[PDB]
Design an enzyme around this catalytic site. Structure first.
Site, PDB file in Angstrom:
ATOM      1  N   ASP A 137       4.733   2.087   3.013  1.00 52.35           N
ATOM      2  CA  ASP A 137       4.417   3.508   3.157  1.00 52.35           C
ATOM      3  C   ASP A 137       3.402   3.917   2.095  1.00 52.35           C
ATOM      4  O   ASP A 137       3.775   4.159   0.939  1.00 52.35           O
ATOM      5  CB  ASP A 137       5.692   4.316   3.005  1.00 52.35           C
ATOM      6  CG  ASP A 137       5.469   5.807   3.131  1.00 52.35           C
ATOM      7  OD1 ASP A 137       4.367   6.202   3.561  1.00 52.35           O
ATOM      8  OD2 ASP A 137       6.408   6.569   2.777  1.00 52.35           O
TER       9      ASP A 137
ATOM     10  N   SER B  10     -12.703  12.965   5.449  1.00 51.45           N
ATOM     11  CA  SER B  10     -13.448  12.536   6.617  1.00 51.45           C
ATOM     12  C   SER B  10     -14.631  13.462   6.852  1.00 51.45           C
ATOM     13  O   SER B  10     -14.586  14.650   6.534  1.00 51.45           O
ATOM     14  CB  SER B  10     -12.527  12.557   7.835  1.00 51.45           C
ATOM     15  OG  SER B  10     -13.207  12.305   9.048  1.00 51.45           O
TER      16      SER B  10
END
Length: 330
Positions: A35, A199
């Protein structure tokens, strides 16, 4: 040194991925959920409340000759999905894919919430976010990657998750055969303890690319792709009959649909998520309403590039003094 381990989807939907991890002497192999959104290595154990164990493999520290109680240390964690676990702490030898760390903090669960009990395939979590998020008190502990870093050939790990198939976690090296083209690297903020990056925009299907900054985290421990409501609405508007259902808890779409792809930007590069990766199947057995793999982050507080996005790429978690993320097509 290096390590290389295969990671395998737990079910036909890729709801999560498990990777075998050797703990203790002699080894006890548990299948952990790696994770990159958390920083605790915790396991089901011989200390876990018996009624809360249902098929998991447990770590028994008393059977490990290298286990040592970390005296006074406790841990307690709550995840973004509302699940939680807590317990005490041992140090022990932990190996992943041939890479060994001695003295790793292994957090033994005394209590786990129902969603953990109900998932017999996940024996615990191995956190790979920054150690500043580790919950051990009163002495915070380091992640497996942090402890291994100095010994690694290069201070990196890579995630290569499969779509409906196994993939690979590598530590200490970049497998140049595992991706196509070049890896585009992008800056990371560690201020929240995550692999947080920005992004450069998105496209829906064959549509034109929209240049816009989307801050979010690369999180192998989250199944879906959570993005701003504007972006998610633009995606689902291209699917006839798709709608946001408050009763279901997100966007659903007709199971008869063919889903468009979704592209996200990494600098000037582009990662394309095929439409099929966005199908999470019937909302309930036999339903013709299917659950979408792209969902709004509006209720979270952060955008999350979870498995839906990451499995479309070869992803480099670069733990150099100034960390960065790398993405390549594959």
């Amino acid at each position: 040194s290096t390590g290389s381990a295969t990671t395998t989807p737990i079910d036909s939907l890729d709801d999560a991925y498990i990777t075998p991890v050797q703990i203790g002497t002699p080894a006890q192999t548990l299948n952990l959920d790696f994770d990159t959104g958390s920083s605790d290595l915790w396991v089901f154990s011989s200390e876990t409340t018996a009624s809360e164990v249902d098929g998991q493999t447990i770590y028994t520290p008393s059977k490990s000759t290298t286990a040592k109680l970390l005296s006074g240390a406790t841990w307690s964690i709550s995840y973004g999905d509302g699940s939680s676990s807590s317990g005490d702490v041992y140090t022990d030898t932990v190996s992943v894919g041939g890479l060994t760390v001695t003295g790793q903090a292994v957090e033994s669960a005394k209590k786990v919430s129902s969603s953990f009990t109900e998932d017999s395939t996940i024996d615990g979590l191995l956190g790979l976010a920054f150690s500043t998020l580790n919950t051990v008190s009163p002495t915070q502990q380091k992640t497996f990657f942090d402890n291994a870093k100095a010994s690694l050939d290069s201070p990196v790990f890579t995630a290569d998750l499969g779509y409906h198939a196994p993939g690979t976690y590598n530590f200490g090296f970049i497998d140049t055969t595992a991706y196509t083209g070049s890896i585009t690297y992008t800056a990371v903020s560690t201020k929240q303890g995550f692999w947080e990056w920005t992004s450069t925009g998105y496209a829906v299907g064959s549509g034109t690319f929209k240049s816009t900054s989307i801050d979010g985290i690369a999180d192998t421990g989250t199944t879906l792709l959570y993005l701003p409501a504007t972006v998610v609405s633009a995606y689902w508007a291209q699917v006839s009959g798709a709608k946001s259902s408050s009763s279901v808890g997100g966007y659903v779409f007709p199971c008869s649909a063919t889903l468009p792809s979704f592209t996200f930007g990494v600098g000037s590069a582009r990662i394309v998520i095929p439409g099929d990766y966005i199908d999470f199947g019937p909302i309930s057995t036999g339903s013709s309403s299917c659950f979408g793999g792209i969902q709004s982050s509006a209720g979270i507080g952060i955008n999350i590039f979870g498995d839906v996005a990451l499995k479309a790429a070869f992803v480099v978690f670069n733990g150099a003094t100034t960390p960065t993320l790398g993405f390549a097509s594959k």
